[PDB]
Amino acid sequence: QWALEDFEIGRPLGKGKFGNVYLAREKQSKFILALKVLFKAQLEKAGVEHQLRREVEIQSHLRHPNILRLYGYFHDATRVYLILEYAPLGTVYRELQKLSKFDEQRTATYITELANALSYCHSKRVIHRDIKPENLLLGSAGELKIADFGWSVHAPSSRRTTLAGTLDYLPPEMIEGRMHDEKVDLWSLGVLCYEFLVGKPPFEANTYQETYKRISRVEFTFPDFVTEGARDLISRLLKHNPSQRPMLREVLEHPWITANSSKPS
Numbered sequence: 001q002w003a004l005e006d007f008e009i010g011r012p013l014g015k016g017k018f019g020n021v022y023l024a025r026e027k028q029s030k031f032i033l034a035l036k037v038l039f040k041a042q043l044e045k046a047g048v049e050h051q052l053r054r055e056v057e058i059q060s061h062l063r064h065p066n067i068l069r070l071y072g073y074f075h076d077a078t079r080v081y082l083i084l085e086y087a088p089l090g091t092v093y094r095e096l097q098k099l100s101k102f103d104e105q106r107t108a109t110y111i112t113e114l115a116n117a118l119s120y121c122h123s124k125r126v127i128h129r130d131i132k133p134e135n136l137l138l139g140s141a142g143e144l145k146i147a148d149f150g151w152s153v154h155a156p157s158s159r160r161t162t163l164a165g166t167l168d169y170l171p172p173e174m175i176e177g178r179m180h181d182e183k184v185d186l187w188s189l190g191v192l193c194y195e196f197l198v199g200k201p202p203f204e205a206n207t208y209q210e211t212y213k214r215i216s217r218v219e220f221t222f223p224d225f226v227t228e229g230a231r232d233l234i235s236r237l238l239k240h241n242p243s244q245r246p247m248l249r250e251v252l253e254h255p256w257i258t259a260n261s262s263k264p265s
């Protein structure tokens with residue numbers, strides 16, 4: 001169906017390990033979108049063809065206001081193209097670097113939107129497993145949208161692919177290569193809440209080996225300015241035993257969230 005000739009390419013929107021994303025406009029409809037370009041050669045080399053198919057299949061059937069749309073795909077002799085919804089206000093990552101840290105109302109609103117989107121995902125037993133600021137985009141009204149479903153699977157699961165970059169957002173069971181389920185996303189939710197309020201993730205360290213150690217032992221402390229309500233929520237989410245982590249309904253109905261968020265469930 002679609003081919004490259006159907007689109008006019010614009011400015012670079014961002015880069016990932018494999019993804020090279022551009023602003024684009026479809027010629028006949030003038031529809032503005034984001035084009036995610038991947039190189040077949042590096043995809044074959046890393047042997048992650050299965051990750052790309054899972055990304056296309058899972059994301060294209062999901063329909064939720066806080067989840068980025070995937071309209072379609074096409075491919076030539078060298079590249080693969082994903083046709084995505086364009087997010088005009090950029091990443092949460094960039095926004096965090098601008099402001100250094102978010103206030104309690106901004107943080108609570110983001111968490112509510114995340115919890116809403118994850119609740120929808122888990123209802124189909126879809127787990128994301130790669131929730132971090134670079135993969136959270138912002139709509140035209142500043143609303144949060146989850147993207148990059150390249151690591152997503154159906155629960156329960158093991159891990160068959162090599163862990164690439166940072167360990168900062170992964171729970172002990174995933175890092176120790178053990179079996180895991182939906183509760184991995186809730187650990188990540190706890191890591192984000194901390195980083196949103198503090199300015200850096202709770203287990204950050206100088207080396208891979210040390211970050212590994214702090215995560216498996218759950219070693220984190222709060223700065224003085226973090227209030228009692230925030231500490232309660234974060235402490236509940238960062239449990240070593242996954243079955244002790246709260247349900248998403250509990251997060252959405254937490255007194256600190258309900259008092260500070262500006263959006264409903």
Ligand SMILES: Nc1ncnc2c1ncn2[C@@H]1O[C@H](COP(=O)(O)OP(=O)(O)O)[C@@H](O)[C@H]1O
Binds near residue numbers: 087
């Ligand atoms: N729909 C989009 N709108 C705006 N920017 C995007 C969009 N998709 C991706 N980007 C930018 O490109 C970067 C990489 O996209 P992503 O799909 O996460 O690539 P990868 O899967 O290689 O990590 C993101 O961090 C973001 O900054």
Ligand SMILES: Nc1snnc1-c1ccc(C(F)(F)F)cc1
Binds near residue numbers: 040043052053056073
């Ligand atoms: N042809 C090659 S080579 N390496 N990956 C591919 C590939 C990966 C994903 C798809 C997709 F259909 F899911 F979109 C198609 C092709």
Ligand SMILES: [Cl-]
Binds near residue numbers: 037
């Ligand atoms: Cl290109």
Ligand SMILES: [Cl-]
Binds near residue numbers: 226227228231
């Ligand atoms: Cl306190």
Ligand SMILES: [Mg+2]
Binds near residue numbers: 135148
């Ligand atoms: Mg990404």
Ligand SMILES: [Mg+2]
Binds near residue numbers: 016019148149150151
């Ligand atoms: Mg990816």
